[PDB]
């Protein structure tokens, strides 16, 4: 009936490098037409901070508006698991709605990255699958990417993290390339970005034998 809040974490990549600007994000939907005024409050471990940046209002094709507030956060505060609260206010609610979010708790575990060449079966096609396996990792927050000769590779998909029997995580990422490119010996690389890696980064390479 009333407005509903939704609280998102920052991207895996953004928390792992000073280069990047990680953010938590409070999205309110079903903001009433008659009362449009939404007030956001942000707290780190209960202690209020103030740098949230409320953004305009995106009117939705169902009568209601959508108000998004973005809190910037320090890399190490998220990595150290500090707790982030969004309190949202509006006259279409009797009480203010709150949401709290934080990194998954627990000893981080270093991912193990193994690359696997195409199956002999598959070498009968005009495209081949280069596979990257990332297992053993915790928390589930990770980024994976591909490249050749310094250049980002376009055509890959990566599975979501899957919970493994030992409570750690794994995924597979698939890069699709022209068989010729594989046949001609070009070197392809799997880039994995996780908290528990040295410099939050590792890169594993694969090429024709």
Ligand X SMILES: *C1O[C@H](CO[C@H]2O[C@@H](C)[C@@H](O)[C@@H](O)[C@@H]2O)[C@@H](O[C@@H]2O[C@H](CO)[C@@H](O[C@@H]3O[C@H](CO[C@H]4O[C@H](CO)[C@@H](O)[C@H](O)[C@@H]4O[C@@H]4O[C@H](CO)[C@@H](O)[C@H](O)[C@H]4NC(C)=O)[C@@H](O)[C@H](O[C@H]4O[C@H](CO)[C@@H](O)[C@H](O)[C@@H]4O[C@@H]4O[C@H](CO)[C@@H](O)[C@H](O)[C@H]4NC(C)=O)[C@@H]3O)[C@H](O)[C@H]2NC(C)=O)[C@H](O)[C@H]1NC(C)=O
Ligand Y SMILES: *[C@@H]1O[C@H](CO[C@H]2O[C@@H](C)[C@@H](O)[C@@H](O)[C@@H]2O)[C@@H](O[C@@H]2O[C@H](CO)[C@@H](O[C@@H]3O[C@H](CO[C@H]4O[C@H](CO)[C@@H](O)[C@H](O)[C@@H]4O[C@@H]4O[C@H](CO)[C@@H](O)[C@H](O)[C@H]4NC(C)=O)[C@@H](O)[C@H](O[C@H]4O[C@H](CO)[C@@H](O)[C@H](O)[C@@H]4O[C@@H]4O[C@H](CO)[C@@H](O)[C@H](O)[C@H]4NC(C)=O)[C@@H]3O)[C@H](O)[C@H]2NC(C)=O)[C@H](O)[C@H]1NC(C)=O
For 208, phi then psi, to 5°, come to -60, 140
Which entry of ligand X, a copy of itself, ligand Y, none binds 203, CB below 5 to 8 A by partner kind? Answer: none
Three-point CA angle 53, 16, 12, nearest 5° = 70
Smallest gap from residue 111 Cβ to ligand X (A): 21
Among 13, 57, 66, 174, contact with ligand X (rule: CB under 6 A)? 66
User: How many Å apart are CA 71 and CA 67, to the nearest integer?
Assistant: 13
Q: Could you count the other beta carbons within 10 Å of the beta carbon of residue 201? A: 13
27 near ligand X, rule: CB under 6 A? yes
- Does the protein bind ligand Y through residue 157 (CB under 6 A)? no
Count Cα neighbours of 182 within 13 Å in the Cβ-side half-sphere: 22
CB 153, CB 188: distance < 8 Å: yes
Q: Which is nearer to ligand X, 3 or 111 (CB)?
A: 3
Query: What residues line the site for a copy of itself (CB under 8 A)?
Result: 1, 112, 114-119, 121-122, 129, 131, 133, 135, 155, 157-160, 162-165, 170-172, 174, 176, 204
For 56, residues 6+ apart whose C-beta sits below 8 A from its C-beta are: none
SS3 123: helix
Per rule CB under 6 A, is residue 29 in the interface with ligand Y?
A: yes
> Does residue 27 belong to the site contacting ligand Y (CB under 6 A)?
yes
Which residue, 27 or 92, has its beta carbon nearer to ligand Y? Answer: 27
Shortest approach of ligand X to residue 8 CB, angstroms?
4
**Any bridge partners for residue 6, and if so which?**
27
Q: Is 85 exposed, middle or buried (0-12, 13-18, 19+ CB in 10 A)?
A: buried
- The distance of closest approach from Cβ of residue 82 to ligand Y in the complex, given in angstroms and rounded to an integer, is 18
Minimum distance of ligand X from residue 65's CB (angstroms)? 9
Binder to ligand X among 56, 61, 120, 165 (CB under 6 A)? 61
Least distance in angstroms from the C-beta of 139 to a copy of itself: 17
92 binds ligand Y (CB under 6 A): no
DSSP string, 65-108: EEEEEEEE--HHHHHTT--EEEEEE-TTSSS-EEEEE-PPPS--
* Beta-strand relationship, 127-137 and 169-178: antiparallel
Q: Which residues contribute to the site for ligand X (CB under 6 A)?
A: 6, 8, 25, 27, 29-30, 60-62, 64, 66
Q: Which residues contribute to the site for ligand Y (CB under 6 A)?
A: 4, 6, 8, 25, 27, 29, 60-62, 64, 66
């Amino acid at each position: 009936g009333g407005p509903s809040v939704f609280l998102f974490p920052p991207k895996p990549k953004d928390t792992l490098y000073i280069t990047r600007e990680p953010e938590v994000t409070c999205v309110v939907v079903d903001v009433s037409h008659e009362d449009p005024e939404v007030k956001f409050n942000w707290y780190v471990d209960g202690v209020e901070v103030h740098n949230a940046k409320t953004k305009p209002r995106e009117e939705q094709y169902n009568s209601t508006y959508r108000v998004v507030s973005v809190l910037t956060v320090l890399h190490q505060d998220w990595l150290n698991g500090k707790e982030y609260k969004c309190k949202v206010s509006n006259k279409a609610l009797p009480a203010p709605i709150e949401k709290t979010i934080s990194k998954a708790k627990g000893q981080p575990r270093e991912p193990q990255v193994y690359t696997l060449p195409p199956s002999r079966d598959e070498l009968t096609k005009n495209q081949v699958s280069l596979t990257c396996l990332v297992k053993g990792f915790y928390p589930s927050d990770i980024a994976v990417e591909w490249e050749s000769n310094g250049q980002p590779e376009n055509n890959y998909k990566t599975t979501p993290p899957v919970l493994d029997s030992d409570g750690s995580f794994f995924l597979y990422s698939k890069l699709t390339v022209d068989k010729s490119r594989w046949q001609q010996g070009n070197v392809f690389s799997c880039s994995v970005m996780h908290e528990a890696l040295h410099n939050h980064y590792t890169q594993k390479s694969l090429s024709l034998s």
